[model samples]
Target: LQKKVKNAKGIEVIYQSSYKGKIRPGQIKMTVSGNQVALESVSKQPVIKNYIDYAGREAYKWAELPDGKIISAATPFEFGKGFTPAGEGKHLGLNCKIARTSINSNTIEVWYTHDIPFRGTPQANVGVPDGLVLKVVRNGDMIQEASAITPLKKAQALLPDSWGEKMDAADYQYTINQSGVITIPVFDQQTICFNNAKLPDTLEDGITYSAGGGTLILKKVKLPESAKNRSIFVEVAQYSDGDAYDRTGSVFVIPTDKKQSFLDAIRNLKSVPSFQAKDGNYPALISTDDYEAPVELMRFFTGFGVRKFNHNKVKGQHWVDSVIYKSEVTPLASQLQGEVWIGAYIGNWDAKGHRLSLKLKYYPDDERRVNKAMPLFNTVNYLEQAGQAYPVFFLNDSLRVRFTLKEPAKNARLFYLTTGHGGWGNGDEFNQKPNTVYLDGKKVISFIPWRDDCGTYRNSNPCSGNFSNGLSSSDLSRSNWCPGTVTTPEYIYLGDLEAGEHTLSVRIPQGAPEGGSNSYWCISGTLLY
Candidate 1:
């Protein structure tokens, strides 16, 4: 609904109600179309017709309704009967009533003019007579007031889109039902529990895989011969039999010729799950204990590196809680045809075996949009180091790397991943500190590295009673790294860099040396066109 209000000085402002739905709720668009005042949507966008309220007025936001028809409505505003007269006041050189109204337990006092020609309220108040709400106060504090009023040239007021049917003010009805009657049966189920039980046999060529203790790959599906040269689909249902961690998994397509061993091709698949280290360059480490080698070289020598490591070897090795994960899969490796073995790869920090079930389907040729731009992503490991005192001393004062971009990159980003776990107080880098970035001796950006959501994943932690008070060590907050969680790589957009030599540097003021504590950071990024 629209409410036009005129202030004591003869200024008119229009407040209109726009889209209303669960997804995007009611938005009030204020249009000051007179030659004197102009209020944009929020910030301002340059869509002239979209926000005709002003030159750079914001656009009206929309919402989705259950009926699926997009529309707008006008809901009359109201002020309840709790308004109490405080005193008489002059608002914009006009007589007004100083009254207060409490909403949601918060007191709002307003000075409203009665002599103005327009009839309206500040936001949603129906009982006020013609004129304007010149000022408003919450509790005893003044929050809003008219600063100034100017004359306006008559401009057409902006209106909502005419795409859908319009309606008057109506209350939406939402209901919650607990009938518990709708359920779908899971098919082609695959269950893997690490309690030392025999894996159930699949329909042949199915595989079960798990990683990092919590990742459990439950099932794989083989496409029908009729589905050759077509886009395939699959459905997955994930569950957690034990405590829950991050449910991360991927569906992969392993193509095979008649000559190559299908099992070998499956083992050679290289799609990396999100949050897992893609190669030896990731997850640099550090230890405070005495070592035979220098601390600088230790980071380069550690990480997973096995060329044909079987799933059976890594299953249950990293142990965490058991969880069931479910998702749908679309065809990858679009060029592959005829009898490809499609499967899922699950990765998590939990150790227990979880269940994954998937079913296959197909899409018509006209129904799918093929991905054509497959560009090579060239990655560079600038800094992979572990276990250094605060300020993270390197061979030089800072970690520096120089590389040449052979061709102008279409897009590039820098990824910095770090986790802190070593000592308490001054020994850990939990407190916030700026990680400065420099490009070719020019200060580019500074970001604070800190994450406080560690406690949310305490259920996935494998250990118990490490604290003196019999609390799990995972319950306590640490730096970026949690006991049984994955560290998200922080990506900084580098935009498009020139094809030439460039120097990138990361300057982190690390933790103080104490309690034999240390920290590690893995930095890697790629340029892709």
Candidate 2:
């Protein structure tokens, strides 16, 4: 076998294959030039194409090693029968075989050429001793068949830049699993309210829907003339009184042939059904689809507080917190020809009335869509529930914050942003509570929140009043915040986080929840890539 081999020093080979339900209907283009090889999907729709260049490179490299010198070839056979040359054929004008391998109960047919000067196949499937495989069939069915073969003067078969992040085979496999979808880019955002106002006959350049107090609100939008056959990224932020998961709402994008029909659908709207979880609860919600297709951006449950395992609340807090939801929809270009309407449903749970704000962002085919910004831990009015831990949120890789401490003890005002927080007023209060940080389950930082210049801003406090005895609350030194002054948010860098699901909670000793006034801290963090 070694003496019969030919040197394929600098030649480039290109092979094209079609699908017969072995996979999706798309052409797979595989090119090999020297040690590098690449396979790509030649269809407009996203499809998977396997590449075996890694094994090809390894095989060639092995051939150069002392232990890899091939002297003879061996073929295993059963009953003195192994491979049978069924017929003769040609690929790129080179002699090849329509051959069959019979082993046990399985038969694999292959179109192999010994005259290609190289032993390689797409996905490194070249297992035969000295054969360059052009097509493969299993169990009498065509698994892969080469449609064309080209001998190129030069082939730049470099892996895509996106593959640079794949450090190993496992990483590359993960990328392949995630590449079946086409992600659209964000072109612009239009804010719409959930008010029951009448939708216009035709969409303006930017139309915002406001459903003041109705269960359903609709807006007819003229998607960008170029929005046909593209994806729309829909993000809805409902600002109403409730827990982050307490509200139940849904956003639907439906197709309408005419503007009058779109308008009538909005006018005769009824109740939008509340999303029913398995246990009848709402979690983080999102939906993705194409344009022209009816897509529910997100159906959520809001207004509920985090109950204990035994289903009990602490003392005062009623709602968890309102969070934002987002989704992406792609419809056919023809379905979005003239006009389409966007409908939003705000379930009436909190009597404070629901105010839903929606934004529809469209993206072209080529740009990458950004992941929606998710909230990790926010202390807006969370400290108002002082005396107990609020709730634990899952943390990601990077945790950053805009933090303001209102009245932690001037010196002992330390806080914990870790996997857990507990021990009530005992764990959080008193002086020198060293601001230590915990990542995953280990301590990662020894940080303390402090500002020694609060007294300097006493004169700028609008709420500071002249005391009868010349002693004022603003003049007194306290932690971080002034009486009526806007406290500068100290940007706390939580550093690199560990991978996987982990809890992020805050623990700050609030001086035993005093009677006259309670101490609290406000912190909001946005996860960054």
Candidate 3:
């Protein structure tokens, strides 16, 4: 195996066995290191653990040649015995590939797996789309199948898509297990009206639910009136052997900017007693920065990959990549129209040594917390690197100093301040913020920020938990700063303003924060020409 260790060279794929037949695509190389193997006659050589398949994404990072050498990207497993559950009767995978996945402050996870067979006869199972729960074990025995599925409201509160209905699981209440295994219940609550909002009147189970739609009209209530007279089937897979199939599937919702348009707001699973994909072509709305308009954004991502079909054609494609922000944010500015604080400074100095990172999650509330009261400028230096400074200011109003670094003044390095918002942070010596002064000459130092996800807390209530700060500095010296509050912070971080080059102007300092306008709370500070 290539000289056994000591200055070992490249190429070492070794083994991969996922058998079916008709094989011919060869490539092997070795540089053995730990529990070795040398394949050519392949006999189950499994001894590779690159940190557990890079923490389980499977694996892939190749080079092998081009004078750089770096390999370990294996894939070989083609249907030896893993696809028999189409119809003989019983097929309980309990929602096979369930999803709701969000893991921020609003937390969400509803994973599902399947496998149940005692040799079928006329009993099939695979139905779970609302709140989940189903864990089954055949011979060794162990099954938990709590019941809960809902969505059927003409008015009483289940809103989203009330005009187009279709509810009826024929007296639903299922929890069968003799060898037919099935269970369901999945959630981590606190989901406001998704799809298009406006759908609450009162009713919470694990807490409200809705996203994407077309045929859902649930109300099975709790299924079990002797199983409602039998006859139940929900296998929706539009077409195949004869042709015509392209149903499409996608749903990821949240505070993700409301420029709205998944073809124009989908709203909960309309109704799917049956759904499948594989060569049927299904992928309608993939998300990630492209909201078109509305504000109040937190983080977003949407993904999908699954294309199955065996005899009729397609059987490949299974992908999953997700990311959702706003673990928690809400201080003010749920919506405010005219003020024009406008911002933009795009630079593409390209790269050579490589390094680019800029994260932003602003606007929070709570008097900017006080220790000294600092909010904007959450700094990280290195825009173009000249002095040790990093400047960009334009102040006048009650605020506005876009960017200005070098406030070191005394060992203040909680990783160099500028914790979450501007100028850099790492506060809470009781919410400090009074340094970086300099009026007519501009140096600034306001407070009240966010993006602390789960950190920084001394006396508490920066929203008390997951995180909530932003928009402090006494909320712009108070006066109903951005008023109209039912609960703001979907997006409103008017901080950071001290970059460089300016004959600036900004005003709104009398009392600032004006949304519904109670008296237009004192706001005066000007000079822009």
Question: Which consecutive 10 residues in model 2 have the weakest lDDT in total?
Answer: 282-291
Residues 1-529, candidate 2: write the lDDT tens digits: 2232244342334444444564546566766555445555565223333443443333211111122221211122122124577788875556777767765576777777767555455533324424566776667654665566556555455543332222344444444433433332211222222233454456563355443333555656565554543455666554443222222345554544322222332432222111122223111111111111133333332222222111333233232233355654332232333455566654443333445566666544555433222223332211111111222221111222222222221111112222112223332211223334444445555545544454454322323333688654344433333322223333344454344444333333333333433333333333322
Residues 1-529 of candidate 1 have per-residue lDDT tens digits of 0133332333434332222212232222334443112233322111111112222322222223443545443333234345778889986676788887777777777777755443234433313322456666666553455544443335544344452444443321111111111122223445423332222334344444431222323233434434333444444444443323332233333333223322331222122211112222211121001110000100110011111111213223343323222322222323223344444433333334345555554544444443211111111111111111222342123445555656776556553444443345654435665667777787778877566776564444443234667554455655555533444445566667788887766665665555456543333322223
Ranking by TM-score: 1, 2, 3
Q: What lDDT does each candidate get?
A: 0.38, 0.39, 0.20
Off by over 4 Å in 3: 1-164, 167-322, 327-329, 334-389, 392-529
* Better candidate number, 1 or 3, judged by lDDT: 1
Candidate 2 regions exceeding 4 Å error are 1-117, 125-131, 138-142, 146-209, 214-341, 351-529
- Model 2 residue 256 lDDT score: 40
Cα lDDT tens digits for candidate 3, 8-38: 3212333221123322243222212222212
Q: State, as a TM-score between 0 and 1, how close model 2 is to the true structure.
A: 0.33
Better of 1 and 2 by TM-score: 1
Best by lDDT: 2
State candidate 3's TM-score: 0.16
